[PDB]
Amino acid sequence: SGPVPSRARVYTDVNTHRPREYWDYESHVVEWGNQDDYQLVRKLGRGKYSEVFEAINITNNEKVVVKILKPVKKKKIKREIKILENLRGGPNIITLADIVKDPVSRTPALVFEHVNNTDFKQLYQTLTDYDIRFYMYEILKALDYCHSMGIMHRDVKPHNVMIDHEHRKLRLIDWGLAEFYHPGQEYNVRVASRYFKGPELLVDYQMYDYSLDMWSLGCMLASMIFRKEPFFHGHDNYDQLVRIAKVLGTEDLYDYIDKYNIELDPRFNDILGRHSRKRWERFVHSENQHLVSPEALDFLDKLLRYDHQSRLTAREAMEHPYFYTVVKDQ
Numbered sequence: 001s002g003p004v005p006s007r008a009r010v011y012t013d014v015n016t017h018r019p020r021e022y023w024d025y026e027s028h029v030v031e032w033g034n035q036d037d038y039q040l041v042r043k044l045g046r047g048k049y050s051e052v053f054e055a056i057n058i059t060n061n062e063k064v065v066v067k068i069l070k071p072v073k074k075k076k077i078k079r080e081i082k083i084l085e086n087l088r089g090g091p092n093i094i095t096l097a098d099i100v101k102d103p104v105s106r107t108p109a110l111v112f113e114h115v116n117n118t119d120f121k122q123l124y125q126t127l128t129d130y131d132i133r134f135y136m137y138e139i140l141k142a143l144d145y146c147h148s149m150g151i152m153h154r155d156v157k158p159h160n161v162m163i164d165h166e167h168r169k170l171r172l173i174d175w176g177l178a179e180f181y182h183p184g185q186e187y188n189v190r191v192a193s194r195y196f197k198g199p200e201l202l203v204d205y206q207m208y209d210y211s212l213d214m215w216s217l218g219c220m221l222a223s224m225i226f227r228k229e230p231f232f233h234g235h236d237n238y239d240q241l242v243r244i245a246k247v248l249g250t251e252d253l254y255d256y257i258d259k260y261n262i263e264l265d266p267r268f269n270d271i272l273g274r275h276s277r278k279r280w281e282r283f284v285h286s287e288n289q290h291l292v293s294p295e296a297l298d299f300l301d302k303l304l305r306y307d308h309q310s311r312l313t314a315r316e317a318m319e320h321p322y323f324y325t326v327v328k329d330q
């Protein structure tokens with residue numbers, strides 16, 4: 001027979017207890033606002049599934065951001081809208097202001113709150129140890145919130161974290177890949193950027209949960225404290241697991257596969273080989289040492305586990321010694 005089932009350790013049944021309409025996004029009816037309320041100012045960026053503009057709401061002269069969606073199935077747009085509405089007002093979640101349609105293109109556009117996000121090239125050369133702890137804590141507040149609300153982000157990465165450094169403000173954006181957690185549900189593993197994919201995705205284990213986000217977060221943390229972006233630099237999805245195995249070791253990987261009775265693609269049998277679990281010390285050097293602490297390494301170790309069940313929860317992560325200074329401030 002097949003893979004062993006799995007349940008989230010936390011927030012397992014939060015959706016089952018909510019009215020169906022909370023999570024049953026196929027039933028959601030979108031209220032479209034008026035495109036004529038917004039005038040586009042400049043293009044900010046492009047993504048797989050959208051073009052992003054700065055715009056002005058001419059009703060009230062507010063700066064806003066418009067995300068014009070490339071063609072996607074109605075149900076995927078409904079999912080993102082429902083999730084954004086459910087999460088609206090939660091800590092460090094992007095605020096969806098409005099939803100409009102071009103009545104000639106028929107293209108849908110999401111309208112967001114404007115966040116003054118800070119030069120990408122620039123700020124990186126200045127991140128102190130404190131800054132990294134602080135912003136990691138801010139991301140964890142967003143993740144604990146969305147997890148507690150029954151939602152997996154499933155695409156946590158630097159591109160999806162806006163920082164307004166002047167205001168010490170952070171927002172988690174791009175909820176287009178997020179999904180509701182239901183115990184027993186088999187999810188699509190073809191999510192997330194290669195470098196941030198959890199082992200569960202790479203081995204095709206479908207019964208995953210919130211803990212996916214914690215792997216992605218660990219990848220981010222490693223890249224920041226070690227000044228190595230990306231940390232796990234695979235050539236493709238197969239090689240991505242090999243890069244992980246060269247760090248975490250193959251013994252624990254095969255233990256995970258055994259525990260869940262996962263059927264490993266035969267492609268992997270050739271290429272995984274045999275690798276020791278490496279000490280984190282091999283990534284420390286004179287340039288990055290100011291970012292690296294016993295605390296940082298202990299925390300990182302507890303995010304980056306093959307076994308999704310063994311990873312810290314968001315709320316556990318927030319209680320780690322890595323954050324004691326930040327917590328004492330607030």
Ligand SMILES: O=S(=O)(NCCCCCNCc1ccc(-c2ccccc2)c(Cl)c1)c1cccc2cnccc12
Nearest residue numbers: 044045052065112115132135136158159161173220224
């Ligand atoms: O296309 S966009 O204009 N631009 C996407 C945002 C840029 C992402 C920049 N990443 C910053 C970042 C993050 C974390 C980090 C970092 C910090 C601490 C620890 C580890 C890593 C570090 Cl070091 C850097 C856009 C797209 C969609 C919605 C938008 C809504 N309102 C404005 C812009 C929007």
